[PDB]
């Protein structure tokens, strides 16, 4: 009664509506984020999807080779996957031209920025009269993007014992709502979930361990880890020191998280860009990659 080493369960799911993808270091968060989308978009034609990114470097545009902006466009070559690239930090900075009690309260700026995103989304579903059944978040590379989930509990730990010198204590109780309505959702293992990307090296396994903890505290559902850029060097056409170490950690991770969906991806020769390759690579999130038989498909990519 072991757990399947892949995301099929997730890509098959019909219940989820929110899926978060993240991991520090250049380990392939973006690549994975796109992969989960396409895979989710191909396995359920009826549903309409949205892959969104907060990163300012416009990575999803780099990943697909297309120019996606603030307007929810559809991937060229797809039918139910739409990408949206937005910068909240800038947006929230214009309707702020004070926030003094924001820097004061850890977690405000985030919640704010987030809601600034949701807005830009419901706005897209209006001018487009198109409802998104599931959204995928390409979590910001640095910073705790979604820390606001604690905002509720913390805003209570400073109200019973703490204080228009009060119009502040109002539009604040009004927030500890928007956030708890949300947190309640993301804290539902059936509606939302988080997938952690990671490379199989020490410092990376640490970080992702940290993160997993961070999500645990927030009461977010962490269930899957995709270990990217693996070698499996021994299954090449012919003769490796790194694979020895990676393998080392892989065994450790399998032992640490026995109830987790640990996915092992291969390190292809060169970039994995554009729908044709992304799709080709992504399928290894569904049916686990087999170094033997699938050794070739990893050389079709450029």
């Amino acid at each position: 009664l072991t757990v399947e080493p892949n995301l099929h369960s997730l890509i098959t799911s019909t219940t989820h509506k929110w899926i978060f993808v993240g991991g520090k270091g250049g380990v392939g968060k973006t690549t994975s984020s796109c992969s989960i989308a396409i895979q989710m978009a191909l396995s359920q034609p009826n549903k309409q999807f949205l892959l969104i990114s907060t990163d300012p470097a416009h990575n999803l545009s780099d990943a697909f080779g297309e120019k996606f902006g603030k307007d929810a466009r559809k991937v060229t070559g797809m039918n139910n996957l739409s990408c949206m690239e937005i910068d909240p930090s800038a947006a929230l900075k214009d309707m702020n031209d004070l926030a003094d009690l924001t820097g004061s309260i850890p977690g405000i700026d985030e919640a704010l920025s987030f809601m600034e995103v949701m807005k830009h989304i419901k706005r897209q579903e209006q001018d487009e009269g198109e409802t998104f059944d599931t959204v995928i978040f390409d979590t910001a590379p640095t910073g705790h993007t979604l820390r606001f989930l604690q905002l509720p509990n913390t805003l209570s730990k400073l109200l019973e014992k703490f204080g228009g010198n009060v119009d502040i204590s109002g539009k604040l109780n009004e927030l500890k709502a928007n956030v708890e309505t949300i947190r309640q959702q993301f804290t539902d293992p059936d509606l939302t979930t988080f997938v952690c990307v990671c490379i199989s090296e020490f410092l990376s396994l640490y970080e992702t361990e940290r993160l997993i903890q961070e999500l645990i505290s927030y009461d977010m559902d962490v269930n899957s880890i995709i270990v990217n850029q693996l070698l499996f060097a021994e299954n090449d056409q012919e003769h490796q020191a790194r694979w020895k170490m990676q393998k080392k950690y892989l065994d450790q991770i399998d032992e640490l998280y026995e109830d987790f969906h640990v996915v092992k991806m291969p390190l292809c020769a060169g970039e994995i860009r554009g729908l044709n390759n992304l799709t080709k690579f992504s399928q290894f999130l569904n049916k686990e990659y087999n170094p033997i038989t699938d050794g070739k498909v990893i050389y079709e990519l450029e």
Binding site: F202, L205, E209, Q213, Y249, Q252, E255, L256
Partner: protein
């Protein structure tokens, strides 16, 4: 019997575990290493709970004659 036998058992246990974790390769035994850590992170809070359990029972007897 609580704010003592507890605040020690643990702080002690923690202290005991802490030195042990520092006797294993966080690298060759990442498995165990991180397990222990996760644990210490737990004790680290229930000890910080008994630190308020023991402090609420003070602001209690003095706020109530």
């Amino acid at each position: 019997n609580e704010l003592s036998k507890k605040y020690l058992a643990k702080v002690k246990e923690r202290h005991e575990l802490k030195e042990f974790n520092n006797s294993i390769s966080a690298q060759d035994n990442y498995a165990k290493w991180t397990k222990n850590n996760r644990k210490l992170d737990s004790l680290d809070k229930e000890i910080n709970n008994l630190k308020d359990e023991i402090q609420s029972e003070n602001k209690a007897f003095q706020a109530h004659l």
